[PDB]
């Protein structure tokens, strides 16, 4: 008997889980404080809309939403996605007619959407432009499908904006896709209208289709500036074929319902094969849970904008509290979180005597204070650490007290 | 601007969708009758359990089931699958210990389960042994990943049993997997215990992990033979590492909920890479809907057997109506359905004057009587036609009448 795994399976790696699963249990007799899990439902402080809950129960009770829906998603669900994106993130009235239900492909959460978007257009040997720090799943898909990766930087000095010139010099004859993430995981950044327009213009110039992971669309803190807003790559006049990832996992706090979508925007028809590929690849898995698709119209169009706003407003409160108090710990210099559910902090390793790496920082902090953060190395950001900002303030107060004490202790 | 789809996306093909979408709208005024659609929820004659739906609503209201669950599935859901399979299809007492929750990997319906099984162990250039007539998704996944297929025959004359000597003659050095389906789509067959045991023996002789698609597990008619029973590949003492596909899509008639599972069985530990491959491949998509997973304990372990049996009993009544009347049409010689939701009928094309293939039969019957069946060539079985059997008896009474007219009209004297 000589049974081995495939090479395809052999190449599948999720850095976040590897570090998590391999974390040694802490000897410290202190109730663990996890700050590394990007799940917004952990404390029951952020709830999903009542409109969504109610419709989901009615679709189940009607017994007419249990059959097979088309693999791309039901017409009704696809129209709700088109309508919500149009109304919410498309401000120029002339571009509103470019967002249509027929260019919407449903998927089984964000990870499936990513898998579909990359493998619809890239073949083994082809290259994708991926951000760093960046959400680890782009690399997970590329590695397993033998797709090359060119990492372009997002610099903390410029509020995590992308190094447009680095993208420009890296592009080559094998590069078929440009991936951007905004708002960002793990940076917690929110691109300004100018920076998004420049990314779109660069794609145009470079002749690259654009995959924009906009799953945190609209989750922008408005407390420190009520004029702050989200800029979708959909709100621009351009000849660039764009594929936008959206979903309800983050803004409606139901990530386990595995509902997300791919929105293709290409009014001048420069990449119709992209959309065709998306439909082809979706036929391997066959779409998301139909009963959840039936509730989507209601969830997006019948949920008051205030419910969405209050979720973000609670995050902001915890994000701002965390940012203010983390700075106070020897060696930790936080970047300002503008939205999403994360806070990225710089670790000044020279201010410690035993700690030499961001990974080492993670390891010792967990071991001594039973506080779990993620090492920036996982996201291709040595020297930084990722913290979640979705837990109640009371959790961070306790956690920062512990991080402080540990920081003072390892100080040089 | 040169945006071209990848080769992977360009190799993805679904024969059922192609035929259905390219079907010409019929000129006949008679209301359309579709016997081609494999969805059991169409007429609302088959309903899912109250236990399942209730727990689903309770899980939603609780709001403790909306977060992330491990990608292999929640422990509770994995325990329910292990417990329900042990309790239903594993009869030898000593073998019950071999079915455990840690060897269960949840997935997003059957289609996803097949994708994970085939790509977890086969690379481009490797071959898999695939049945014919067979469920198209095996080929869909294989063609798309550049995995070669050795087709083995399931013979109509032997009750659609797998031709074991042809399997043995096709196995080669690149062959990494043996795929079996039972009960079958589209044959409607149910393997006797004896035939399943030789499938297991042959898998052992060729040293090939077995992937058994048992999504219709337990859906066997008990009206002709009351001693009839489903025999899962789990119920045998063997060295063969087995991956079994199971789900709620067919027995609990909720296919759209996208819930299925892979059950790895390998007590002598001859292929642990296979289970690991399953966990790996699943990290790309990240599991099924958590709210659906949270209702699975209740669905399998709290739905009375009477409900499951009653669904099969209604399918059986429609299946037996179809079988006893389809044979009255000139040229249609039906094989007998033992389970699942399908009926496979032979088409003796020599008995007609204008009809040469089964695709012609499909098109002309559609064009003239507005009755849509599936051409057997889709499943790699020319000269046959697949009919669904889950619709009410009234649909078959009118459909047979139109087909009998059609066949008499094109019959060669």
Swiss-Prot record, chain B:
It is found in: Cytoplasm; Mitochondrion. GO terms for molecular function: L-tyrosine-2-oxoglutarate transaminase activity; pyridoxal phosphate binding. GO terms for biological process: biosynthetic process; L-phenylalanine catabolic process; tyrosine catabolic process. Pfam families: Aminotran_1_2 (PF00155). PROSITE patterns: AA_TRANSFER_CLASS_1. Pathway: Amino-acid degradation; L-phenylalanine degradation; acetoacetate and fumarate from L-phenylalanine: step 2/6. The modification N6-(pyridoxal phosphate)lysine is found at residue 250. Its main location: cytoplasm. Homodimer. PANTHER family: TYROSINE AMINOTRANSFERASE. Belongs to the class-I pyridoxal-phosphate-dependent aminotransferase family. Transaminase involved in tyrosine breakdown. Converts tyrosine to p-hydroxyphenylpyruvate. This is Tyrosine aminotransferase. The lineage of its organism: Eukaryota, Discoba, Euglenozoa, Kinetoplastea, Metakinetoplastina.
């Amino acid at each position: 008997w000589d049974v081995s795994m495939s090479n395809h399976a052999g190449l599948v790696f999720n850095p976040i889980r590897t570090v998590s699963d391999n974390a040694k249990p802490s000897p410290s007799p202190k109730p663990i404080i996890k700050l590394s899990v990007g799940d917004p439902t952990l404390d029951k402080n952020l709830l999903t809309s009542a409109a969504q809950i109610k419709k989901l129960k009615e679709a189940i009770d009607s017994q007419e939403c249990n059959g097979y829906f088309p693999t791309v998603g039901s017409p009704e669900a696809r129209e709700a996605v088109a309508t919500w994106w149009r109304n919410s993130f498309v401000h120029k009235e002339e571009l509103k007619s470019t967002i249509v239900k027929d260019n919407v492909v449903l998927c089984s959460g964000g990870s499936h959407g990513i898998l579909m978007a990359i493998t619809a257009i890239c073949d083994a040997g082809d290259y994708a432009l991926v951000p760093q720090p960046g959400f680890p799943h782009y690399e997970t898909v590329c590695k397993a499908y033998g797709i090359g990766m060119h990492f372009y930087n997002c610099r903390p000095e410029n509020d995590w904006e992308a190094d447009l010139d680095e993208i420009r010099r890296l592009k080559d004859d094998k590069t078929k896709l440009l991936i951007v993430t905004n708002p960002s995981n793990p940076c917690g950044s929110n691109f300004s209208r100018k920076h998004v327009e420049d990314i779109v213009r660069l794609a145009e110039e470079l002749r690259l289709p654009l995959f924009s992971d906009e799953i945190y669309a609209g989750m922008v803190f408005k407390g420190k500036d009520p004029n702050a807003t989200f800029t979708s790559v959909a709100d621009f006049e351009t000849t660039v074929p764009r594929v936008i990832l959206g979903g309800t996992a983050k803004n409606l706090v139901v990530p386990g319902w595995r509902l997300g979508w791919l929105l293709y925007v290409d009014p001048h028809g420069n990449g119709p094969s992209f959309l065709e590929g998306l439909k082809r690849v979706g036929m391997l898995v066959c779409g998301p849970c139909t009963v959840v698709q039936a509730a989507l119209g209601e969830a997006l169009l019948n949920t008051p904008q205030e419910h969405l706003d209050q979720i973000v407003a609670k995050i902001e409160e915890s994000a701002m509290y965390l940012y203010n108090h983390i700075g106070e710990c020897i060696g930790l210099a936080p970047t300002m979180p503008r939205g999403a559910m994360y806070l990225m902090s710089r670790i000044d390793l020279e201010k410690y005597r035993d700690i030499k790496t961001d990974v080492e920082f993670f390891e010792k902090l967990l071991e001594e204070e039973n506080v779990q953060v993620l090492p920036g190395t996982i996201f291709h950001a040595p020297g930084f650490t990722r913290l979640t900002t979705t837990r109640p303030v009371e959790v961070y107060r306790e956690a920062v007290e512990r991080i402080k004490a540990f920081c003072q202790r390892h100080a040089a």
